[PDB]
């Protein structure tokens, strides 16, 4: 009925914008000159011109979409008419609209309707096409003539056909023509609720959802991504169970938006007092390291650091060759617990953004791969849903041991440049996976690897451990001694340590992990403590030449150069002294 055309072109054109020099005219030329189909306009942009548009958009987008996208095509064509041929319809699209509602609760009610929805996107099917609208002719003495299928509505997954025709008004033969037909690209993926809204019980809920035209390969799964959709079902038919709506839920996408550094941060807000309380001079980095550790104390005083230090960041990313391999990496094989990472695990999913995988892995992948089946005829969907979907996070792994044979050769790549190479010839794609390993193994007969060498002990491994900074074992604990206090420690007292605060358990990760706003580039003095530390412990094996295997910091004096300067990237912005003295001391420890 009532007709927004006017507002349209009015605005558009008219609206002022952030410089107060004219926009959505210059998208609209960077659109036509660059032969793309999408125009994305932010809604807070559009309620700062008219508010009326918002609700009559936004609740019934079903039906006003298409019309203003038809009515702005129009537009664009006398911009520059030779835009024809090239594209059919332009899309509209909104960003940020103020509906965010959680996949988890979803109300029934909010089929068709406009609204935006957080989560991670796990799993994705390869590019595909469809049929937008199919062009017919009827041959008889009473037709000769063409037609569109699907009239004022689209056509499904499965296409229909005859018996009767407008055109003549009879029953008969149709044939179809590619001449006349249109085409469209398709793609189907699947949001998974993030790992931090999953309550404690039950399991995350998922979302399938539908790529349309150029939002193809937009979005690739381990991302946490905003996407902003209409909802539908379709269902035709559904089988198997039961549980539950019974709808199949379509969400139909207009815009996707994977902005953002870390999102997951919980708050900051009054706690920047209080992590800044907690910077005070006072040793914080040894009681930091008493923190994680509680409560148990088993020869842990290295453990305890390279833990610490697992947590925390150092991503130098360069345009040329992106070097990183930061995040460390580390390795604890014991015998059964033993307390192994039955513990400290438990304590490293204290964290933002950590992803515990119990075993080799989880959903079929466990590092990532391609699938079968699953619904459905064949439908082959790419999924990776364990370390993959660490990105800017930890991956604590336990049992190491039980790894899957196919998977040991995936994680030489997402290890090394945390990239996956993937092509089953479903796709071929490079996946993210920035995440840092805490990984936990069992050896081969229990306790074994005192005399025998910490190879071979880990079973499938022979190389992997390589791309590991830090190796710890588990000591069988013969000489221990030390227990009266150190067990009794918790077993009645509360306190332990001097602190004795331990920076609780939530807000040491409300500042510790959930605060990287540092990025501590290590300088002067550093830089030559580590290098003649560098030169002495190479000349100290490449002295003797029964080539004593190098010691081997030829790659490592890399990820040290890492440790250290990002070990202390314990708010210390930009200071690095002697924090090296630590490193090198750890890694002098660790080479011998
Ligand atoms: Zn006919």
Not at 207 to 230: C, F, N, W, Y
Not at 429 to 444: D, E, F, H, Q, T
């Amino acid at each position: 009925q009532i007709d927004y055309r006017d507002v349209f072109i009015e605005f558009l054109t008219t609206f002022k914008g952030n410089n107060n020099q004219n926009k959505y005219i210059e998208r609209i030329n960077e659109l036509v000159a660059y032969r793309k189909k999408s125009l994305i306009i932010e809604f807070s942009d559009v309620l700062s011109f008219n508010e009326n548009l918002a609700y009559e958009i936004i609740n019934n987008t079903k039906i006003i979409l298409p019309i203003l996208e038809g009515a702005l095509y129009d537009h664009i064509l006398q911009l520059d008419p030779t835009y024809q041929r090239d594209i059919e319809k332009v899309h509209v699209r909104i960003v940020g609209i103020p509906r965010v509602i959680e996949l988890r609760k979803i109300r029934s009610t909010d089929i068709g309707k406009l609204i935006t929805i957080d989560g991670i996107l796990v799993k994705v099917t390869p590019v595909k096409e469809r049929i937008y609208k199919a062009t017919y002719k009827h041959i008889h003495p009473d037709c000769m003539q063409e037609f569109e299928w699907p009239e004022d509505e689209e056509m499904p997954e499965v296409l229909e056909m005859p018996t009767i025709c407008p055109k003549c008004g009879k029953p008969g033969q149709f044939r179809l023509i590619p001449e006349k037909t249109k085409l469209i690209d398709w793609q189907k993926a699947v949001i998974q609720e993030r790992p931090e809204e999953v309550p404690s019980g039950q399991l995350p809920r998922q979302l399938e959802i539908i790529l349309e035209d150029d939002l193809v390969d937009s979005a690739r799964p381990g991302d946490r991504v905003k996407v902003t959709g209409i909802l539908d079902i379709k269902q035709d038919s559904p089988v198997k169970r039961g549980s539950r709506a019974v709808f199949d839920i379509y969400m139909k996408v207009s815009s996707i938006e994977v902005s953002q550094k870390v999102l997951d941060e919980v708050i900051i807000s009054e706690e920047d007092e209080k992590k800044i309380k907690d910077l005070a001079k006072d040793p914080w980095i040894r009681d930091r390291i008493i923190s994680s550790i509680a409560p148990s104390i088993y020869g842990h005083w290295e453990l305890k650091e390279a833990l610490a230090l697992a947590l925390f960041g150092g991503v130098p990313k360069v345009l040329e060759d992106t070097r990183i391999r930061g995040d460390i990496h580390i390795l604890i094989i014991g015998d059964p617990g033993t307390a192994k990472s039955q513990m400290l695990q438990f304590i490293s999913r204290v964290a933002p953004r950590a992803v515990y995988t119990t075993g080799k892995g989880s959903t079929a992948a466990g590092l990532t791969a391609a699938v079968v089946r699953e619904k459905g005829t064949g439908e082959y969907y790419l999924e990776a849903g364990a370390l993959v979907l660490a990105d800017g996070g930890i991956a604590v792994i336990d049992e190491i041991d039980k790894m899957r044979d196919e998977d040991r050769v995936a994680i030489h790549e997402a290890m090394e440049q945390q990239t996956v190479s993937i092509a089953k010839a479903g796709i071929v794609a490079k996946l993210n996976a920035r995440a840092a390993v805490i990984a936990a193994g069992n050896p081969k007969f229990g306790r074994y690897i005192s005399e025998r060498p910490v190879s071979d002990n880990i079973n499938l491994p022979p190389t992997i451990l390589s791309r590991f900074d830090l190796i710890f074992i588990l000591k069988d604990q013969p000489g221990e001694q030390d227990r009266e206090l150190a067990n009794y420690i918790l077993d009645v007292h509360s306190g332990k340590s001097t602190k004795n605060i331990i920076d609780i358990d939530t807000l040491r990760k409300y500042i510790a992990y959930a605060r990287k706003y540092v990025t501590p580039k290590i300088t002067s003095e550093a830089k030559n403590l580590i290098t003649d530390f560098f030169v002495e412990m190479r000349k100290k094996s490449s002295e003797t030449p029964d080539s004593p295997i190098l010691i081997t910091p030829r790659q490592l004096e890399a990820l040290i150069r890492i440790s250290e300067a990002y070990a202390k990237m314990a708010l210390k912005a930009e200071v690095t002294r002697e924090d090296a003295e630590r490193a090198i001391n750890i890694m002098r420890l660790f080479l011998e």
